[PDB]
């Protein structure tokens, strides 16, 4: 069981892993246009951290986009394959992600949430009330009136997972 950053380097190996992850995303996010998931996952700005089982099988992951100069990143997609849910993987992934973000000098995590989703990120430490100056993400992260923008502060020396 590994949580590795999956590089989109045009190799058969990584490409396959990214595709498997993309398929888990669409199967688990039915309201999301599959081609839209494809677009983001493989674009120049996004990165993915995968939950790798037996160093070959993808069972989950999180797609995100860092805004390095601004020191914040947006979570695009998060998911664990159906037959592997409710085993603590999703929470362990999020913790590995925060630790990686802390190491990447990222100060805040932002993500849009709807319905149930909101409850999930609240349990993952995200809040509706932001402490990050609005004008900081304005212009970088699209402002949708239809979704709840949530944020998680990444303190420089709090221990998240490992």
């Amino acid at each position: 069981l590994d949580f590795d950053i999956l590089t989109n380097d045009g190799t058969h190996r990584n490409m396959k892993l990214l595709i498997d992850l993309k398929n888990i995303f669409s199967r688990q996010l039915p309201k999301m246009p599959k081609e839209y998931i494809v677009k983001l996952v493989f674009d120049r700005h996004h990165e993915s951290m995968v939950i790798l089982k037996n160093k070959q099988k993808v069972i989950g992951g999180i797609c995100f986009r860092q805004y390095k100069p601004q020191r914040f990143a947006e979570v695009a997609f998060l998911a664990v394959t159906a037959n592997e849910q409710v085993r603590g993987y999703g929470t362990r992934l999020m913790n590995k992600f925060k630790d990686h973000m802390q190491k990447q000098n990222i100060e805040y995590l932002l993500t849009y949430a709807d319905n149930f989703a909101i409850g999930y990120f609240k349990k993952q430490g995200f809040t509706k009330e932001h402490r990050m100056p609005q004008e900081k993400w304005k212009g970088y992260i699209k402002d949708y009136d239809g979704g709840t923008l949530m944020e998680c502060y990444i303190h420089p020396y709090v221990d998240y997972g490992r």
Binding site: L29, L78, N115
Partner: peptide, 8 residues
């Protein structure tokens, strides 16, 4: 992160 309830 499009979500419509469910999600186990």
């Amino acid at each position: 992160k499009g979500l419509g309830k469910g999600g186990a």
